[PDB]
Amino acid sequence: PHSMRYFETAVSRPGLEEPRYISVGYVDNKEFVRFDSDAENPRYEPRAPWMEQEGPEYWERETQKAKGQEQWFRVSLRNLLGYYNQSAGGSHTLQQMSGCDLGSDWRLLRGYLQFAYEGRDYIALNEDLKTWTAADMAAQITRRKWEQSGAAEHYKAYLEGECVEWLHRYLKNGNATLLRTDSPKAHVTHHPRSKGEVTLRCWALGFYPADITLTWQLNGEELTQDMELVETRPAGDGTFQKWASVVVPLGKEQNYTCRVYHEGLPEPLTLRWEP
């Protein structure tokens, strides 16, 4: 159930100064490589400890392809200006997502190739890897252009070929690393509010990956009734945090339990307010 994606962005800025091009690679949703045109000496850079293995040749090759991509976005960016009737001196964004997913068997399960402009779907390659799904009128020009040139075939080759060969490779190099986990460490905090009623908040900190489940219960019953839940957030050190809470009637506090479910725990966690 692995995958590899390259998220590319090109943003034009006021003036005749070429746009900034940023390209980021992922394996199983983890950033492993990165390139930025703004940097001092622009080169592709390692972003996961297991990528330092690749010798000079690899980084050189990747750096070139990226310089080509940057030019490709420069050109494409001008054409869009026309498609939409935009003056040559504004702020624009062109994005691309490409990659492949491997199934249980490690065979290509699906390939991806999409673009967005100004934050919206523009044109995407279909699962068949031969037909396109343009999002609007403007995008039709491009779709017609790409059909009338077999542009789809070009991507198909990459998606079923190199994409798969290199994902297998990266998976081999960063095997155990990628498949790691850090269990969350939980604790409950008490906070006042309403006359009588009070708030109990269950915290989950230091866990990886970000997937986690926080539940509150009253007398063994899933209290999915009015529970505060923040979006999971990065702590900064590479781990995550998330918390859920509920408003409870004072005194009847120790009548509630928090349960934490995470892929890294030997067994789920249960904890209650501890004055």
Binding site: Y44, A66, Q69, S76, L94, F115, H154, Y155, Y158, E162
Partner: peptide, 9 residues
């Protein structure tokens, strides 16, 4: 492995 785009949009 950075993919290299085909025809421009």
């Amino acid at each position: 492995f950075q993919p290299q785009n085909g025809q421009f949009i």
